[PDB]
Each structure stands twice: as C-alpha cells, then as structure tokens.
Amino acid sequence: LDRERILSLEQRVVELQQTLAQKDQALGKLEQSLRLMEEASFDGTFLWKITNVTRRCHESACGRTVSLFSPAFYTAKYGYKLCLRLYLNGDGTGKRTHLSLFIVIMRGEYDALLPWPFRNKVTFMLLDQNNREHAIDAFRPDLSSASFQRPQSETNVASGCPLFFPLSKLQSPKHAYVKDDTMFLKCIVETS
Amino acid sequence: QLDRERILSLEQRVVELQQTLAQKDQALGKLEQSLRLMEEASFDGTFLWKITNVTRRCHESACGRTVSLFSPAFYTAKYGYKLCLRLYLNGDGTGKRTHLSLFIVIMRGEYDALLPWPFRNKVTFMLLDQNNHAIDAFRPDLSSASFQRPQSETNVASGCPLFFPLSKLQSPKHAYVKDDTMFLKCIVET
Amino acid sequence: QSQLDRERILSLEQRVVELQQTLAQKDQALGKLEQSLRLMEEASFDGTFLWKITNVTRRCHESACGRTVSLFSPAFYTAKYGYKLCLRLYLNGDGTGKRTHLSLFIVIMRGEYDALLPWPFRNKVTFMLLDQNNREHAIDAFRPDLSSASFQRPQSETNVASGCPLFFPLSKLQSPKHAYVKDDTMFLKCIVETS
Amino acid sequence: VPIQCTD
Amino acid sequence: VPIQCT
Amino acid sequence: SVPIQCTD
Secondary structure, three states: OHHHHHHHHHHHHHHHHHHHHHHHHHHHHHHHHHHHHHOOOOOOEEEEEEEOHHHHHHHHHOOOOOOEEOOOEEOOOOOOEEEEEEEOOOOHHHOOOEEEEEEEEEOOOOHHHOOOOOOOOEEEEEOOOOOOOOEEEEEOOOOOOHHHOOOOOOEOOOEEEEEEEEHHHHHOOOOOOOOOOEEEEEEEEOOO | OHHHHHHHHHHHHHHHHHHHHHHHHHHHHHHHHHHHHHHHOOOOOEEEEEEEOHHHHHHHHHOOOOOOEEOOOEEOOOOOOEEEEEEEOOOOHHHOOOEEEEEEEEEOOOOHHHOOOOOOOOEEEEEOOOOOOEEEEEOOOOOOHHHOOOOOOEOOOEEEEEEEEHHHHHOOOOOOOOOOEEEEEEEEOO | OHHHHHHHHHHHHHHHHHHHHHHHHHHHHHHHHHHHHHHHHHOOOOOEEEEEEEOHHHHHHHHHHOOOOOEEOOOEEOOOOOOEEEEEEEOOOOHHHOOOEEEEEEEEEOOOOHHHOOOOOOOOEEEEEEOOOOOOOEEEEEOOOOOOHHHOOOOOOEOOOEEEEEEEEHHHOOOOOOOOOEOOEEEEEEEEOOO | OOEEOOO | OOEEOO | OOOEEOOO
16 A cells, blocks of 8 residues: 555645745745835835846837836825836837836825825936936826826826937936946925 | 655655644744734824724624724834724723724833833824814823833723714714725824 | 656655755745844934844853854934945944943945945944933944045945944943943944934 | 723 | 826 | 944
8 A cells, every 4th residue: 555655645745845836936925025115115205226227128128028117105104105117118109219107096005085186296307327417307197187086996007208218318328327237217296 | 664664754754844834834924914014104103094894893893702903003203102002893991882992002112211201192093084083182191000111012001982982983974984994093292 | 566656755755855945945035034024124214223232241241252243233224215324333342442342333335326325425423322311321423534445335235344443431331320231231323414 | 081991 | 298108 | 533444
C-alpha cells in the first residue's frame, strides 16, 4: 500500500505548492499596499516620480503598456480620492505627439459627505530638474461632464490634458524634464 | 523498509510545512490588519468614523455577541494623546434600549510620559446627516480615572450614553443611516 | 510499480526541498514588510522627530560592551517631499565624546526627491534631551557645514553622520535636580528648520 | 457631564 | 480645458 | 553651532 501513501503525499505537496503560491501573491499585494500608503498625499498636492522613463516609453510605444496610473492621493484625510493617468505615448488628439496627463476622480470611502460635482481647480506641472521654466497647465473641471459627478462605480472616466506636453520638447536638453530616466509630474488641487 | 522510511519522513516534512505555512498566513493577517489601522489613523484630534452594515450591527448589539464597537485609534497630534471611540448601537447603561452610546477612550500612548495629566481637552461628538446633524460636547471630568494617565492599555470609556435616540435614527426625514452606513465625527480640541 | 514508486518518492523529496526554500524566502520577505510598516509608522514629515529610547540601562551596557556601537533612528522628513533624515546615537560616545558623553549626529539620507531639492543641506538642526519632569531640557543646535560632504546630495543611501559629539555628559543623566532617564526610558527630539 | 461606560 | 480620455 | 562628523 505504498502507492496509496505516495499518491496522498503527491496530493498534499501539489496542494502546498498551490496554497504557497497564493500566499506569495497575497504578500506581493500587501507590499504594493504599503507602497501605495507611502506615496499617498492628503493635502491636494501630489508629486509623482516616474522612473525608467526610456523603458516605459518603449513599453508605451507597443501594445503591452497603454497608460500609467499614479498612486491615489487625497484633497484631505476625509476628502476626494484622486489619481493620475499618464500616456507617455499620447492619447486621442495627443496620441504619438504629446504626453497625455488626465486626472481620475475615484470612489472615496467618505465621498457620501462630500459636495458634488467635483469643482476644485486642477493644476498639472512637468518639473524641470533645473531651477526654472517647468511646464505648467491648469483647468477648471467641466461640471457638466459625468467625470466629476459622485462616483457610482469605482472610478470615473479620466479627464484632463491630452495635449499636456509635447514629446519633442522632452528630448531637448535646454530643460531637464528627464534626468537619469526619471521625470517628476506634479498635481495641485485647490482647497475648496 | 528504508523506502517506506523515506515516505514517513516525507509525511512529517509535509505536515511541518502545512503548520508553518498556516502560521505565516496568520502573520499575513496581522500585517494586513495593522496596515488598515495605520491607514485609518488621524493625527490632528479629529476623527471620522464610518460604520457600515448599520442594521446587522444593530442586531449585533441588541441580540448579537458584540457588546460594543471600537474605532481605530487616532491622535491629538503625532506625539499627542492616543484615543479611540467605543460605540453601543443598542446603548449602554441608561442609554440602552433607547439611545446609542458613544464614549471617548484614552489609550496608553508611547509618549504619555511627556503629556500633561489629567487630559483636559474638550471633546465633541457628532452624528452626521448627509442630507443635512446631531452633536454633543463636554469638558473632561478631571476627577475621573477615565482621564488620568493610563496604567493599563486603555482607561475606562467615558462620554455620552444618551448621545442619540434610537427612534430618530430609524426616522426617514433624516439620513443618519444612508445605504446602511452612518458617520460619527469626533473632534478633540487642541 | 517498483520503479514508479522510487521515481515518485525521489521527485517528492525534490518538491519538499523546493517548498522549504521558497517558504523560508517568503517568510524573510514578510519580516521585511513588517519592519517597513513599523518604519513608516514611526516616520514624521514636519521636520521634528521624537525618538523614544526604551531600556536605556541595557542598551547603554550594550554600547559600553560594544555589542551595539551606535543606534539609528527611523527616517523622518522635513516635508512630504523634502529631505530624508535620521539620527545616529552613541550612548558610549563617539570620538572626543567617547566614554564621557552622549554623541548625537544627524544623517542626511538619499531621499526619493533629492533631484528637486537645493544642495548642500543648510537647514538648522536642533537636538534636545527631554527631561521627563519638565525642569530643564538639554538643547544644542547647529547650522550645517556646507563644505562637509555629510551635507551634500547623498551618493549612496546615506552620508557620513554629522552632528555634535559631547552632546550630553553621562554624569548629568543621573542628575539630582532632574532625571532625564525615567522608567528606563529617555526621549530625544530633533527639530530641523523647515522654513 | 461625561459619564463612564460600564466597561 | 478638460478633455474626456479616449 | 558647527557640525562635527562621526567616526563613520
């Protein structure tokens, strides 16, 4: 009856491999959660550090990478939940020509107490590592757009600047918009 | 003989891996819980408590096993007082079967050796109305052991046992429980 | 089958080895995650940091014995996107302060946004040993030396610790007017000029 | 008047 | 100038 | 108020 014991051992070992794999996945998700809390901002000002810019630009130039989603940041501890969507390859009218930087209104745990629709002024900023002349855009949310209503789902459709920054100017050395495969975006949401 | 001995050794190793992996699973649970609590904490004396499944928790207070509910800890400042809330949905003491009870809880802080005692910071409670609002407030009783420097992990909970009538919570005109969710707001003055 | 049973036993042994190795590795990863959560819980982002040192007698004896030469505080920050800092504490003492004083140094660390911050570091740094009786705190302060490589943009994860040795004589720890060590604990407070 | 909980 | 993401 | 480096 050694065959029975060996088959039972085979069963328990395959089970241990499966369960162990699931635990490894859950651990990875926990680490990602910790990274998300580490980079969360609660004053409406969020600074996004994009590393491996050239590699991610090659990924965006192909079909594997569409866009990047920034860590969630908040206007206040109990304020609006926001994140950013970045197209290094472009999007819509800016596809293959510009950086596309959109803002995403997400479902907050406390948004049942928040005023709607979202009206706060939004400012995008591609940072020059040098002293000055970094690119700055700003917009008022289109209150008639469904992208700023209270989220009935997890996230609303992103809205922002598809022609945010010309990809051509990124290569130029006059401004240090990319240094060591790392560029910094900055979102500033007005307190309201 | 010896091959069967190898089988037995493999059985023991497998059992050891099972129990060890279970312990690691428990550790993962503790870490995820600590992560959630760290996420929930505030450090400015103001705390917004979101209670979900209000109906099931109400049945879990009138007849369910949980006597009360404890909020995640929060702080008056990064190195201030450690505090939390104790909530009796079916009420406590006089408030039970009529009102919902809400008490502040001074918890043992890592920096209590540097904090003034007894804790005298004015405390404010609020029940929030989305449609828009219940509110109470009190100066801490400095003659009570609830506000002395904690000798245990927490002191005796103290606050308002008649904070809000149970009948007004069920009432339709106000939206205190919207989608089976209510919001209690604590503001500790600094 | 005799051959099938031997093959299955051997391959099962290999599988058990693989499981033990991977389980150990993921356990180490879990420990690292725990320490990281503790670190981000201890961190502050306003330029001030309150370092609580527990079991001061035991740790001091470890420093005198040499088991733990110095201690490092959790990393704190001047702002959410400011300078990453920490503290280095010599209970026995370092250099001139060795065996006679508490030596307290600040450490400029490689923050994730050092490219956007001006260099060298020039924010005034204030060290305090807190008297738990609120009679008299031990206060020192300095402006960063710009010509020192300790206050430049970090090349590695950490610069050479720079601060004040002789920050506090060990004789004054057990002071008659007031004891800075109370219940075998003491509190160090660093205040960096955030402006 | 803050009132203690029955704990 | 918000533009719906496409 | 002048820093003194550590022994490293």
